[PDB]
Amino acid sequence: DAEIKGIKPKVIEEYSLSQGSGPSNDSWKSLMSSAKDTPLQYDHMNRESLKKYFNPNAQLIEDPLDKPIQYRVCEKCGKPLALTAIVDHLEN
């Protein structure tokens, strides 16, 4: 089939594609400020579709069966505790 000459110059310009072939000086740590600003995101549950087709107050667990129920068991009373519940349970 057809060999590629290059990407359309017009497209190169629109998207500022011309880059430096050398290593990036980017840092993933620089993202923290934007991350803190930004509401919880899902890998594959589109935020706008969620607003449209689901309830605003819906509970959402992404890939619930991804792995087992992550919990620990209180050695005092034996209750199974969600990670985010352990500290408060240890205080009551």
């Binding site: 993933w28 991350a35 995101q41 309830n55 129920i69 620990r72 068991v73 199974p80």
Partner: protein, 433 residues
Amino acid sequence: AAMSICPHIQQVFQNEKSKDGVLKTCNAARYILNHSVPKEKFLNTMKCGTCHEINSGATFMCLQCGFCGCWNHSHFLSHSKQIGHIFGINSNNGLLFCFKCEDYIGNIDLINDAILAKYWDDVCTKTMVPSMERRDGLSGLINMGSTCFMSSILQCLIHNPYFIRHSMSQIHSNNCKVRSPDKCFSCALDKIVHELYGALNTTSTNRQTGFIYLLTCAWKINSQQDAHEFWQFIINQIHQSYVLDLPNAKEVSRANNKQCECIVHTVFEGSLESSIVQNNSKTTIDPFLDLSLDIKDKKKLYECLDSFHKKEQGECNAIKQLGIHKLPSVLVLQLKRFEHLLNGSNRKLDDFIEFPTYLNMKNYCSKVPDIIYELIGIVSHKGTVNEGHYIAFCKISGGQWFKFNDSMVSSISQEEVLKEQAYLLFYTIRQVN
């Protein structure tokens, strides 16, 4: 003591300041992955600093510096040696990789539970990992006299990720005003979870105490033996208990017209749009907690939904249509199988209806994107409308399915599960495009 721990993270973990720094960075990376919009996430956590490709295999976020390096061209490996940074986090899943071991560090609870780093010493001393036998919550409920219509439902509730999170989070226990499992349903259900996933104490029956408490609760509030009816009964009790534990139920109600923050109404509820006939003349929105479908002369669940969604039958048109206005996080379907005729006789419909492991709801919402649910629960009925038996089938992590036949819990192939005559189906939301 066959399987070992990465000696490298262990070494670095001998210094406290180093331990806290690694955990802070892990939490940090994970936090960013959960609060980055798609484009940012691709361009900033899945873009290799060396070859600048997106998704050149997993891309790793380095612990010690800002670099991201890809797998497929070995560009993080190159980074680990030339700079001495051997720990990277996969930006698709937050797992920590060691490039000396060339393996993930997956068996250190502190790392797995990093969110608790600041409290780890308390956590470790006062709580223990689940026991091998209870880790998956698997345990049968004895049939105590035509109570499989209850036990089948409970099994599905107990293996529903949302309800399980809700119970283990202590939400209800922390606000309940009765505090008695022999009187409060929600307390009774909490106790079952406790028995099945933890340890309740310090023949031949075991782990039936919660279920017995629930029967006792049931009796205090007060036949047909319809599992669907008990589903509705129990989800209602959870809601009523939520409302009972509020300091201000009255005013919250008129606050936001008939809207509820309870586990039931934030997980299981959706709404149907009933439309009259190119605009729609009129529209009524009505909540549902499940969809009851007709199965007569149909062979597949999609055909049932298609039927339910059909146009039937003025200013600019008139035609009637039922569609979904809002979907729930967990979609529960009843396939109507019990006919109750006018002469007082009852007729059971044993028609097999094919149902898929993944259900796409896009065609039934009033272009709609793929909205894909995962089948995680089946309740099946065998026999007559009143003298029948219910069995539950549940899917847990890893894809294994389990059949709950009263006290017998057995494993079953997905292929065989799919051959079941489904009565209720539980689907959990998995992907929304």
